[PDB]
Amino acid sequence: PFFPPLYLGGPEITTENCEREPIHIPGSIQPHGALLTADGHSGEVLQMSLNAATFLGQEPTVLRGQTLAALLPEQWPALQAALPPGCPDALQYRATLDWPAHLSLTVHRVGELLILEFEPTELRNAMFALESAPNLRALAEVATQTVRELTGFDRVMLYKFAPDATGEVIAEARREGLHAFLGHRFPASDIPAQARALYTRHLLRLTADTRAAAVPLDPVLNPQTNAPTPLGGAVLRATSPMHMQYLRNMGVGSSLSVSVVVGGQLWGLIACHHQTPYVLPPDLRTTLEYLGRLLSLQVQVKEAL
Amino acid sequence: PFFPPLYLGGPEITTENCEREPIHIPGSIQPHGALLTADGHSGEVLQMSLNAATFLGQEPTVLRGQTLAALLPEQWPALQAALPPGCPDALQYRATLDWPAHLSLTVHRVGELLILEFEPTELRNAMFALESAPNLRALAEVATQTVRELTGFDRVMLYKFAPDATGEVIAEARREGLHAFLGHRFPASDIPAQARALYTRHLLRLTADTRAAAVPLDPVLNPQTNAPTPLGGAVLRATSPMHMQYLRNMGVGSSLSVSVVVGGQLWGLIACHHQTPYVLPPDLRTTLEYLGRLLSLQVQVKEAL
Ligand SMILES: *C/C=C1/C(=C/c2[nH]c(/C=C3[NH+]=C(/C=C4\NC(=O)C(C=C)=C4C)C(C)=C\3CCC(=O)O)c(CCC(=O)O)c2C)NC(=O)[C@H]1C
Ligand SMILES: *C/C=C1/C(=C/c2[nH]c(/C=C3[NH+]=C(/C=C4\NC(=O)C(C=C)=C4C)C(C)=C\3CCC(=O)O)c(CCC(=O)O)c2C)NC(=O)[C@H]1C
Numbered sequence A, B: 001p002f003f004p005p006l007y008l009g010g011p012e013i014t015t016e017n018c019e020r021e022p023i024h025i026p027g028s029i030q031p032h033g034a035l036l037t038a039d040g041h042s043g044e045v046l047q048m049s050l051n052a053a054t055f056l057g058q059e060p061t062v063l064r065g066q067t068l069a070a071l072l073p074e075q076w077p078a079l080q081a082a083l084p085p086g087c088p089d090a091l092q093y094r095a096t097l098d099w100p101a102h103l104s105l106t107v108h109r110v111g112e113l114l115i116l117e118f119e120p121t122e123l124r125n126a127m128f129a130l131e132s133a134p135n136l137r138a139l140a141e142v143a144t145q146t147v148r149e150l151t152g153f154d155r156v157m158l159y160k161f162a163p164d165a166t167g168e169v170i171a172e173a174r175r176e177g178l179h180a181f182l183g184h185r186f187p188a189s190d191i192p193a194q195a196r197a198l199y200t201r202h203l204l205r206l207t208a209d210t211r212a213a214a215v216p217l218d219p220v221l222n223p224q225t226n227a228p229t230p231l232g233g234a235v236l237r238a239t240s241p242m243h244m245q246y247l248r249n250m251g252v253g254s255s256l257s258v259s260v261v262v263g264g265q266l267w268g269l270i271a272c273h274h275q276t277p278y279v280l281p282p283d284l285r286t287t288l289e290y291l292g293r294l295l296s297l298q299v300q301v302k303e304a305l
Helices: A052-056 A076-082 A124-132 A136-151 A193-201 A241-249 A282-303 B052-056 B076-082 B124-132 B136-151 B193-201 B241-249 B282-303
Strands: A034-039 A045-049 A092-097 A103-110 A113-120 A155-161 A167-174 A204-207 A215-218 A254-262 A265-274 B034-039 B045-049 B092-097 B103-110 B113-120 B155-161 B167-174 B204-207 B215-218 B254-262 B265-274
Touching: A034 A052, A052 A113, A076 A092, A103 A282, A124 A136, A124 A282, A136 A155, A136 A167, A136 A265, A136 A282, A167 A265, A193 A254, A193 A265, A204 A241, A204 A282, A254 A282, A265 A282, B034 B052, B052 B113, B076 B092, B103 B282, B124 B136, B124 B282, B136 B155, B136 B167, B136 B265, B136 B282, B167 B265, B193 B254, B193 B265, B204 B241, B204 B282, B254 B282, B265 B282
Parallel strands: none
Antiparallel strands: A034 A045, A034 A113, A045 A215, A092 A103, A103 A113, A155 A167, A155 A265, A204 A254, A254 A265, B034 B045, B034 B113, B045 B215, B092 B103, B103 B113, B155 B167, B155 B265, B204 B254, B254 B265
16 A cells, blocks of 8 residues: 655665555646646636746735636636536646747546646657567567657657566667666666556656655645545656656656556556656647557457567 | 666666665755765855755855855864864864854865755753663663653654564654554665664764655756765755655654664664654764764673673
């Protein structure tokens, strides 16, 4: 079972108990966007990331308690219609807003809570390139090479899980001068069981800046439940300190991965590194999610042979 | 061999390589005091902790380059006479200064560098209590109980090293309500080899506040040598992040230990915890150093029987 999070008196995570980090409920976000939680009926803003004024203009203490009818009058009705009570937490409302001096808005529902993620915002041959691959290796290589072209990431790897959950880099497209990870294998504990579980459900995650401090949600608990706000489906979710350190020690300033899910099992990751911090456009991330789905279908086929 | 420190491009320490942390050259101090390094001939202030204005009044950018003749006109000549070239780094000049609105000054020499530590400042039956102990256990118990009375620490332990460097709490005096560590043994890696080595030479260290950020030395390298400033003999030395986390996970806000050195070997530690941050007076620390020396003589005698 998970430790309590830091804000509920849980210990700081060490290598003895990686697997017990409640990574899904960090009570904080990455500072390149803002996060609001709102009641799914009233649209009352229940929680905000402490940086919410940097993106949304209003004071933090004045945003709390206001409704999405006031804040987002054109989106609020579409938001309600798109994310009614009972819908799954993978379903997402996405809107582009014009704001003082563009913001991408991503909304999903967990129970009675709407989770709103604000971040700044501002192809076809890829699918047939994956399809044309004669064997798994070729597919692996075209997948990593295509993802690198679309994203500009310094390194894109296809990271394959073995049955014992150890991983291997089976293909990679890298910037000139970077050393190869191709064929290197890594312990199961590098992506621990709860991460692997989370990654089977929520297919994309990232750390835009491996040195950025996480921005608290205030209030930290959902006042609907007096319990942690589930952030597994929020891309703005704060990354595990343990993983961030791992990335820093590798010289990785930005990281992003996409789950490759085959037969309902975590088959692998498209894993991306940038040496510098790097915010991939939200539209671009949507392409990667889709590319990961398409790759997952292709991998099932070609690995059967 | 040690990793380079963080400021010279070394990695962040993980449990794989605890023993490679260059804990003696953190390039930083604990924020409850200030540290200056000065040339041992000219008294030119070569490095300062970035907080030096909080304690010493002058601007940081104006302190750099000034001499101890200007700053400390009454101490500078005594300092030079007390710490001439070639003297050992355990030798310490200690002075009490009156300052705007008292500061304890501790100086030691390493090579051609004077290291100046500033912190705010403001018994006899103990020795005969140690002497009167009929066996090692009794001595252990009176030692921890005496240290607790003198310091007010919430927990004082006698931590004994076994031949395999695993440790055991063989005696402790604790605040009511604290759970016992008596008889508990711990892995060798909790106090890794370089710490054990450092602790054989420099007999006292502390973390006044296990949540305090370390204050950088500026410039970080000694300009005499373009190499790290040795801080093994500075009590203001920043504590290993790994140890600070360990203490935080135990609910320890302040920690202090004194080496018990028997036959030139690290026999054990008088290890002290406070739940809240806690700065022990510099005079009081001097008593503990002496108590640790006296305890070390007593332990040699009584363990022979
Ligand atoms: C005791 C804690 C450990 C630990 C925790 C941890 N790791 C992750 C997430 C990832 N780890 C990854 C590992 C690699 N990336 C690489 O590039 C390579 C080798 C070339 C490896 C082995 C990857 C890909 C992820 C996924 C996230 C990402 O794509 O960056 C988590 C979960 C993070 C989160 O979602 O918040 C956790 C908790 N990792 C360790 O190494 C030990 C110390
Ligand atoms: C991978 C790194 C590890 C590690 C590093 C580490 N630990 C120390 C210093 C100390 N550790 C101590 C251990 C204990 N204190 C206790 O109270 C108990 C149990 C009741 C234990 C086992 C102690 C006493 C010290 C000495 C300092 C002090 O008195 O607080 C260092 C050196 C710190 C420094 O001087 O900068 C280091 C590098 N410790 C681990 O547990 C692993 C994670």
